[PDB]
Scaffold this active site. Structure first.
Site, short mmCIF file in Angstrom:
data_model
loop_
_atom_site.label_atom_id
_atom_site.label_comp_id
_atom_site.label_asym_id
_atom_site.label_seq_id
_atom_site.Cartn_x
_atom_site.Cartn_y
_atom_site.Cartn_z
N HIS A 53 -2.84 -6.48 -4.09
CA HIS A 53 -4.28 -6.42 -3.79
C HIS A 53 -4.71 -5.12 -3.11
CE1 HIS A 53 -3.20 -7.68 0.38
NE2 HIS A 53 -4.34 -7.07 0.69
N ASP A 98 1.82 -11.32 -5.02
CA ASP A 98 1.05 -10.21 -4.47
C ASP A 98 2.01 -9.07 -4.15
OD1 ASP A 98 -1.07 -8.74 -3.57
OD2 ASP A 98 -1.31 -9.88 -1.67
N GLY A 189 -5.66 -3.96 7.56
CA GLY A 189 -4.89 -2.74 7.49
C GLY A 189 -3.39 -2.97 7.55
N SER A 191 -1.87 -5.33 5.48
CA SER A 191 -1.48 -5.66 4.11
C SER A 191 -0.57 -4.60 3.53
CB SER A 191 -2.71 -5.79 3.20
OG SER A 191 -3.26 -7.10 3.24
N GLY A 192 0.45 -5.07 2.80
CA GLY A 192 1.40 -4.22 2.13
C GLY A 192 2.66 -3.94 2.92
#
Lengths: 241, 64
Positions: A53, A98, A189, A191-192
């Site tokens: 995402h 994801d 911020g 995410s990932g």
């Protein structure tokens, strides 16, 4: 992999600063303007894993070896992205599967502040209740208008999916692992970036920061892409590329 | 408050979530809001209200 040259010391909302460089697989995904929008993890010299995402393109940059995004003294590697491998079975309405892989145009130079997190096998079992760690440059407080300059960390426990569904129900899929709800929360911020648990002395990527409370409530768990359910696709992607 | 885009499960009342994605946060009416924690956040309402809400995009089918 998974053994930082600078050892992390553990005593994101209600986290704490990391020992500088102590999470050397953590990378920052930054746009043309140098703006951090997402985190990621180095899995080897040429590949970063991150969240689907986050929407990464080859216009974005992988920044490795940072601790203080407001300091100009760290030897950071600003690495171009040659190709983006967004999992085709990422369902954007469900936030399931994801995950996205970034093939670097040129290799990262591993060092005491830049190196790889271990990948698990599709059959490793990370028991509900293990204390793991998540890291990032996401918000330290939900109403903040900017993200912290310094890498943050937080210890938090994993949850069985079944217990996690008590919070979120049918939104929870098998390609998801839940953690937190224990006084901390990942936040905008983050995410990932990684959720890591320390297997046989080495930190191993167990989750990818995916979604959660719109307010980063510290009493409801964060959701992570369950790396265990996606690492075969990861290894086969690398094998073919 | 509106929804362009619901989807419903095998009940009647059909349990319809709104699928609409909004950046940063959900509209004031939503009672449970989740977000993919990028920046800007990608945010969804997981509520169960309807029966689907008002469409957001105006109607366009009366002049002719």
């Amino acid at each position: 992999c998974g053994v930082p040259a600078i050892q992390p010391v553990l005593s994101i909302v209600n986290g704490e600063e990391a020992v500088p460089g102590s999470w050397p697989w953590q990378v920052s995904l930054q746009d043309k303007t140098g703006f951090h929008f997402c985190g990621g993890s180095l899995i080897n010299e040429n590949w970063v894993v991150t969240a689907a995402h986050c929407g990464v393109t080859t216009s974005d940059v992988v920044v490795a070896g940072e601790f203080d995004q407001g300091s100009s003294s760290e030897k950071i590697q600003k690495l171009k992205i040659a190709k983006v491998f967004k999992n085709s079975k990422y369902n954007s309405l469900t936030i399931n599967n994801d995950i996205t892989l970034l093939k670097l145009s040129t290799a990262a130079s591993f060092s005491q502040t830049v190196s790889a997190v271990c990948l698990p096998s599709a059959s490793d079992d990370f028991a509900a209740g293990t204390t793991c760690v998540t890291t990032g440059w996401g918000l330290t407080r939900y109403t903040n208008a900017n993200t912290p300059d310094r890498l943050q960390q937080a210890s938090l426990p994993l949850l069985s999916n079944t217990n996690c569904k008590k919070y979120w129900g049918t939104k929870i899929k098998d390609a998801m692992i839940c953690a937190g709800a224990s006084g901390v929360s990942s936040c905008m911020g983050d995410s990932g970036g990684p959720l890591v648990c320390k297997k046989n002395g080495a930190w191993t990527l167990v989750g990818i920061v995916s979604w959660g409370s719109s307010t980063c409530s510290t009493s409801t768990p964060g959701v992570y892409a369950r790396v265990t359910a996606l690492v075969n696709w990861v290894q086969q992607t690398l094998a073919a590329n | 408050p509106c929804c362009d885009q619901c989807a419903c499960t095998k009940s009647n009342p059909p349990q319809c979530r709104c699928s609409d994605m909004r950046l940063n946060s959900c509209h004031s009416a939503c009672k449970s809001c989740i977000c993919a924690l990028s920046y800007p956040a990608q945010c969804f309402c997981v509520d169960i209200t309807d029966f689907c809400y008002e469409p957001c995009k105006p109607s366009e089918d009366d002049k002719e």
